[PDB]
Structures are given as C-alpha cells and as structure tokens.
Amino acid sequence: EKLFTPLKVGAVTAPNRVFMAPLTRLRSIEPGDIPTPLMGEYYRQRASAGLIISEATQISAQAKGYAGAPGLHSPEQIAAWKKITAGVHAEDGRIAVQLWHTGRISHSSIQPGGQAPVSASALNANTRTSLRDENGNAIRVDTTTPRALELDEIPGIVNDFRQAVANAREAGFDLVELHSAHGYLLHQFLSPSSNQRTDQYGGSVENRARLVLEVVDAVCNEWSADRIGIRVSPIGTFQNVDNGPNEEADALYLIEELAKRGIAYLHMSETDLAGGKPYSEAFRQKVRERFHGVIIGAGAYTAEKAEDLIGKGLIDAVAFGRDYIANPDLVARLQKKAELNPQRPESFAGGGAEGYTDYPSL
C-alpha cells in the first residue's frame, strides 16, 4: 500500500495520499458570507487528511453564486478563516482554500446591486444554484442569464483572484486551489459550449485558456508557484458544460501550459455524481508525461482504485468527497479496512451541526 506514505505537494509535505475534496456545504453567515466556528470544528475533525481542500470560496462579492458559500474578500472573512486555519494547524493538519468565481451558475438576487451574473458569453447555464429561503434553508433555483464580460473587465477578474490569494496567504492557508472545473467561471471560458466570444478570450484553445493562464501567472507571482494548485474537469460534461469537440487535445494543451509554471498540483475531477466513461489509461499517460507536479484524482474513487493508479505511476493522491463528509477519520478507516459511516445526503447542503460535525470517528 502507498496511500499511507508521504507526498511532497509543492511547499508542504502531506503525510498520506488521502485528501479531502472541496465540498460546498452552504453553512456560512449572511450577511457577509462569513465562515463560522462550526465550520472550523468540521475542518478540525478532518485534520488527519493528507491535505484538506476547502469548500469553494468566493474571490469577490461578484463571484458569489450560492447562498451560504463563504468568501475570502472582506476583512471579516479573513479574520474568520484565520481562526479556522489555526485550528487545523493545532491538530497538525494542512489546508488549501479552493477559490472560485461562479460566473453564470448564479442568480441576480445574490449579486451586487441585484444584477445579472457575469460570464464569457450571455448564455444561460440552464441549471440551478442554491439560494436560501426566508427561514434560511437551502433551496434550488434556476440560474439567471448572464452578462458577457467586456474585454476591459478581464484584468479586474485576474486582480480579484490575485487579491484573494494575498488574502488566503494572510488567512493561514497552506495552498490555494483554483476552481477551473464544474462549469464555473474559469471553465466557462475554457469550454467552447459556454464561450462564444470572438475576441482574444474565445475561439482558439489558446484564447479559451487565456484567462485561466493569466490567473495562474498572477497568483504564482503574488505568492509562489509551489503554493498553487488547480482543479479541472476537462473530459466529459459537468453541470451542462461539456468540453467541446476536441476535449483531449485541448486538455493536454492546458496541462502543458500549466507545467511551464511549475505549480504544486493538478487536481482532475473525472466525473460528476451520475458517472460516465472512465479516463483511458492512454489519456492518463499523456497527462503524466506532460505534468511534473502532483496529480490528484477524484470522482467516485475507491481506495483500491487509488492504489492501482498510484502503483501504475499515473497519479500521486486521491481526493474523496462524500466519504469525507461522513468519515472525519477516513484515513484511519481506510488504513484499518474499517466500515465507513452511513452518509446522510439530506444534510449535505445547508443547515447546521446535524449532518456536519456529528459523524463519529472510530
């Protein structure tokens, strides 16, 4: 077994290869999109993970698409996250913040000024996001048609990612993960399905990847390349965003570009919850020969699949999502071959302590 052996992940050293995937739980305070001590307890419980990757966190107020998702743009958010990272560190853990802009997976009622959310193009996502009702409970609501960003707004978006990384470093995170997956803003630019722009940020794959690579360069310059990871979902369809008619070649272009920056890791979200065609071993080989940082695989993994792919030299670590919701001590359980706690999906999104901090250890 290799899952319980250490791994260098850029600037930090993980003691095992069992990572906690980013998981939106929608329990932040409004007004202010503020993380809470309850969230701190949840993360502290999971500090034995090789690496915790936080729930997706707004780079700006405009970035918000979900009621209850936290930000990392305000002083109060910075202060609250500082307490959370300190608690994880007190338990000898490591924590990355996943930073997003939701783009068109959003609703005008939670945008600044009540305005339409932004995207690469003015095309509805044709999905739902999660808002809160008058009692503060999570509700699913159809997405608002977005406004296409003007060319002169793009530097501001890059600056918002840069600023959020400055804030993340101050807040005590060990790494940052850019959310370039799952149909959110960066992926909206990457995908031809969502990007119909005819300027330097659409058309060719070079142009479609331009924004994400500008963001990568800005955040590497703000902090250091060995502090930066990126999550992609570049094969298949996620939240109605496919990867276009040349998805493999386009993915390999992006990955070769990322490699040039010497970033800490590439995190591949392989499938959504409904599943789909597995990655071919040939594709995994092509990725591996092009990227020289850590590769994290995710999406309905088992420990056995992770060991197989680590043993084949194709990935370095695995991120578990739902098994981490339900098993704070997932590392110990997988090491000991213990049963896993029963998941309670009704409490994944929103609410309070129940279904959040009340899953037991062994």
Ligand X SMILES: Cc1cc2nc3c(=O)[nH]c(=O)nc-3n(C[C@H](O)[C@H](O)[C@H](O)COP(=O)(O)O)c2cc1C
Nearest in space to 161 (alpha carbons), one of 59, 267, 238? 59
Length of the chain: 362
β-pairing, 18-20 vs 317-320, is parallel
Q: By CB under 6 A, is residue 129 in contact with ligand X? A: no
Provide the sign of the torsion angle of the four alpha carbons 231, 237, 241, 247, taken in this order.
positive
Work out which of 122, 300, 314, 340 binds ligand X, going by CB under 6 A: 300
User: Looking at beta carbons, which residue is closest to ligand X?
Assistant: 321
Q: What is the DSSP string of 15-59?
A: SSSEEE--------BTTTTB--HHHHHHHHHTTTSS-EEEEEEES
> Which 3 state secondary structure label does DSSP give 265?
strand
Work out which of 7, 17, 18, 24 binds ligand X, going by CB under 6 A: 24
Please give the Cα distance from 190 to 213 (Å, whole number).
Answer: 10
Q: By CB under 6 A, is residue 269 in contact with ligand X? A: yes
Work out which of 65, 103, 192, 299 binds ligand X, going by CB under 6 A: 299
In the stretch 199-238, what mask flags binding to ligand X with x, by CB under 6 A?
--------------------------------x-------
Q: Find out whether 73 is annotated in a ligand binding site.
A: no
Work out which of 14, 18, 22, 355 binds ligand X, going by CB under 6 A: 22
Q: By CB under 6 A, is residue 51 in contact with ligand X? A: no
Tokens 């999109």 map to which residue? Answer: 33
Q: By CB under 6 A, is residue 68 in contact with ligand X? A: no
Q: By CB under 6 A, is residue 98 in contact with ligand X? A: yes
| Cα Rg, the chain, nearest whole Å | 19
Please give the Cα distance from 350 to 344 (Å, whole number).
Answer: 13
Q: By CB under 6 A, is residue 44 in contact with ligand X? A: no
> Is the backbone peptide bond immediately before 117 cis, with ω within 30 degrees of 0?
no
Q: Which residues are annotated as a binding site?
A: 22, 24, 56, 98, 140, 179, 182, 231, 300, 321-322
Q: Which residues are annotated as a binding site for FMN?
A: 22, 24, 56, 98, 182, 231, 300, 321-322
Q: Which residues are annotated as a binding site for FMNH2?
A: 22, 24, 56, 98, 231, 300, 321-322
Residues found near ligand X in the complex (CB under 6 A):
21-24, 55-56, 98, 179, 181-182, 231, 269, 298-301, 320-323, 348
